[PDB]
């Protein structure tokens, strides 16, 4: 019975963990596009 | 990288490339979590 709860806890953890990875990805890619945006704006 | 050396259309293209890479990366991630989920949902449904 511990198992079902624990399994249930992991499933409910997936989206919040996934959305947090995605957020990390977006910050990473925003960081990579930022000096490009700057060069465009400085012309 | 001295981005100022590139033309506007070159810089725009790099942005399109990065946008495509970012979506692909997010896809990889959604897919990874989908496989964890199916294994979990199987165990739960048992």
Author numbering:
A (entry chain A): 9 to 51
B (entry chain B): 2 to 47
Mind quoting what the paper says about this structure?
Recent research into cellular homeostasis has shown that the Hippo signalling pathway, which is mediated by mammalian sterile 20-like kinase (MST, the human orthologue of Hippo), controls organ size in animals and regulates cell proliferation and cell death. The MST-mediated apoptosis pathway is controlled by its interaction with RASSF family proteins and the WW45 protein. We also elucidated the MST2 homodimeric structure and performed structural and biophysical comparisons of the homodimeric and heterodimeric interactions.
The crystal structure of the SARAH complex, consisting of the MST1 (residues 432–480) and RASSF5 (residues 366–418) SARAH domains, was determined by SAD from a single SeMet-derivatized crystal at the Se K edge. The MST1–RASSF5 SARAH heterodimer is characterized by head-to-tail interaction of the two protomers, forming an antiparallel helix dimer between the elongated α-helix of MST1 SARAH and the h2 helix of RASSF5 SARAH. While the SARAH domain of RASSF5 consists of two helices (h1, residues Glu66–Ser373; h2, residues Ile374–Glu412), that of MST1 has only one helix which corresponds to the h2 helix in the MST1 homodimer structure. Thus, the h2 helix in the MST1–RASSF5 heterodimer is three residues longer than that in the MST1 homodimer. These observations suggest that the h1 helix of the MST1 SARAH domain becomes unstructured and that the h2 helix extends to the N-terminus when it binds to the RASSF5 SARAH domain; this was confirmed by NMR spectroscopy in solution in the current study. In addition, the side chain of Lys398 of RASSF5 was found to form a bifurcated hydrogen bond to Glu458 of MST1. Moreover, the guanidine of Arg470 of MST1 formed a bifurcated hydrogen bond to the side-chain carbonyl of Glu388 of RASSF5. Therefore, we think that the extensive hydrophobic and polar contacts in the MST1–RASSF5 complex stabilize the heterodimer structure better than they stabilize the homodimer structures. By extension of the h2 helix and unfolding of the h1 helix, the MST1 SARAH domain in the heterodimer can provide motional freedom to the MST1 catalytic domain.
